[PDB]
Amino acid sequence: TLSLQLPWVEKYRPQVLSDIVGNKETIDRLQQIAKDGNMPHMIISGMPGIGKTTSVHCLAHELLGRSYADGVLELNASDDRGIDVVRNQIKHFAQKKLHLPPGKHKIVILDEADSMTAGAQQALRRTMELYSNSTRFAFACNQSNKIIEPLQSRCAILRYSKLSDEDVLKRLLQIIKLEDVKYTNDGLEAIIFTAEGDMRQAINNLQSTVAGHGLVNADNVFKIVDSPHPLIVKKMLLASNLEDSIQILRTDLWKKGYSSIDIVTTSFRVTKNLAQVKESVRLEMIKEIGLTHMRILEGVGTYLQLASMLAKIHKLNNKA
């Protein structure tokens, strides 16, 4: 069995708060907390892959360089995050006597706290209210709606935002300077367009393209990763001249092996997030796509159901 090279996702994982590129105000605030020391309870939320847990880990490393292995607790959904284990472990950690530097506090990191049970969060509320001058919590969830209201009340909400293409380009050029590779600007633009703000997706696509071909060119990138289905579905829905939408479907979704359920769900999401057309036409289109979704889920999954959904959408578009 051959050995495996470390993936570029964590082979170039940042270790300093200056390495991560993104929301400049957020990173400056994190650096200020790093220099000062008095870290408040924070709830970091945002889209996947935009550098949430890496910032928390870098901040904890900078704050507890010498006592990271002793005064930092890391829990996630992979651990038994239930009321008994949360109670016992968090209360044992929050009362443990560890002589940190005067500005440094214990940090309890809870990755992906969105999937955490309500009673465990209720216990965490009381634990945070008791032990706050010795330990400081730190959540990192994709959506902050799952976390109960009192936990957000006693924390400091800090939301991330999707990275602009400039920051993804800067990081990609930094990694390309770190490891030698031949690239074309068209290939990098294609990778950035495919990533859609997801830095981890960009790194995975770049690594896959380099391993598959060795040259980061537009054709190689489009061979490794296909065009995203939301874009082709949006092109299908927005286009008039029903025959054109029918052939777009039959060419780019049916013969490319996309399941009918996936096409219908993607159409629902696209027409929900669509902004070019007015509200009433979006509502009708959602109604028709939902009727087709009901038909598909009942079991009648064929090309003709999708064609009929497109036909009803186009009859709506031409205003009968």
Partner: protein
């Protein structure tokens, strides 16, 4: 060791006049807790105008971060009583509550002996925080707490968030009903002026109203917000107030009345309203209370004066159009809650039951939002059914 504690604990109310806002609730609670002795010797039968004599226990409810715990603790400490605080971190099921503070309800403290003039230093006050955190329901401790309210020889204080839970029903009138509200802007303004003086950060007297209204009166998050802002930039003015507001909006889950009230507004469905309040926002608004929203739309989808009528379309035609989609979404709800349990149709049910029917009858209202009446008539219909099968069994 100072300058490491949170700003929400070092700047905490020490005495009763430092609790900004809700002075009436605090003074009522103190009056109730100060006259429980004579009421106990009166066998909880005779009460004054306020009724504190006949209320053996008092419970506290309201939005977070307004001072329920702090005011309760200060009142308990000031009058010489010995605090006994409980929580959801300690399991309070039937077994652990019957073997918990059940013995301490009619028993006196031991620490009051060696801590002693104090006339109530040999008593207990039961401060049960996080009682909404106990989601046990049946055999989950709520009935045990009802029994405790019925029979306790010591003051009993409960702290929760809001009362509209069906779990919270058994405390309809057995417990006192003191309630806290959002504190006024003047008291918070004075408190934050003192905080700004203490922490030498610039705080304009006019940005504070926006800081309060973004946080919805949650004082603790306000203090945390000023702390985290002043970490890197201790001066705030009109320049950064919009960025601070958009970055630290509270984003409360809306109350079942509030989802219907926001959804029936005609402003959000206009061309400007659609851009500011997108369709995804309406879907999230439905999913805030996806259980009660489809009904709550339906009971009052026709009691609104329309403002989004198409030219040539009467109000009754819009009501019929909304009713057709309510009927259509009924089928989707049935298919979701069936043997197959196709729960991927919930976003469909959003549009088919709340978005579209409210998109035709939007505008200013004839009256206040009417609660879902389908629940009560469904209960009465079920009782009528049970009676009919009963008399059908008897008649054969």
């Amino acid at each position: 060791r100072e300058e490491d504690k949170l700003w929400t604990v070092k700047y905490a109310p020490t005495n009763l006049q430092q609790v900004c806002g809700n002075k009436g609730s605090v003074m009522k609670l103190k009056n109730w807790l100060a006259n429980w002795e004579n009421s106990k010797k009166n066998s909880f039968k005779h009460a004054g105008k306020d009724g504190s004599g006949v209320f053996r226990a008092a419970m506290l409810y309201g939005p977070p971060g307004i001072g329920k715990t702090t005011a309760a603790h200060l009142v308990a400490q000031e009058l010489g009583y010995d605090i006994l605080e409980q929580n959801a971190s300690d399991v309070r099921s039937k077994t652990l509550l019957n073997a918990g503070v059940k013995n301490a309800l009619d028993n006196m403290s031991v620490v009051g002996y060696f801590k002693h003039q104090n006339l109530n230093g040999k008593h207990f006050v039961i401060i049960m925080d996080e009682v909404d955190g106990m989601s046990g329901g049946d055999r989950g401790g709520v009935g045990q707490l009802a029994q405790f309210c019925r029979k306790t020889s010591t003051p009993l204080i409960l702290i929760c968030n809001e009362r509209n839970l069906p779990k919270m029903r058994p405390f309809d009138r057995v417990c006192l009903d003191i309630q806290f509200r959002r504190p006024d802007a003047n008291s918070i303004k004075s408190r934050l002026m003192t905080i700004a003086i203490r922490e030498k950060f610039k705080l304009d007297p006019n940005v504070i109203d926006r800081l309060i209204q973004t946080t919805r009166g949650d004082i603790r998050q306000v203090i945390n917000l000023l702390s985290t802002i002043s970490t890197t930039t201790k001066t705030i003015n009109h320049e950064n107030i919009n960025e601070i507001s958009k970055a630290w909006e509270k984003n409360i889950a809306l109350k079942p009345f509030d989802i219907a009230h926001k959804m029936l507004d005609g402003q959000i469905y206009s061309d400007i309203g659609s851009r500011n309040f997108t369709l995804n926002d309406k879907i999230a608004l439905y999913f805030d209370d996806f259980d009660f929203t489809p009904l709550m739309i339906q009971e009052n989808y026709l009691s609104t004066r329309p403002s989004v009528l198409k030219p040539g379309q009467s109000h009754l035609e819009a009501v019929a159009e909304a009713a057709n989609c309510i009927s259509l979404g009924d089928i989707v709800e049935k298919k979701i809650r069936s043997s197959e349990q196709l729960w991927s149709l919930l976003p469909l049910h959003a549009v088919l039951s709340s978005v579209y029917p409210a998109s035709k009858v939007a505008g200013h209202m004839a009256g206040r939002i009417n609660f879902t009446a389908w629940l009560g008539q469904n209960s009465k219909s079920a009782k009528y059914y049970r009676l009919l099968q009963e008399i059908h069994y008897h008649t054969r």
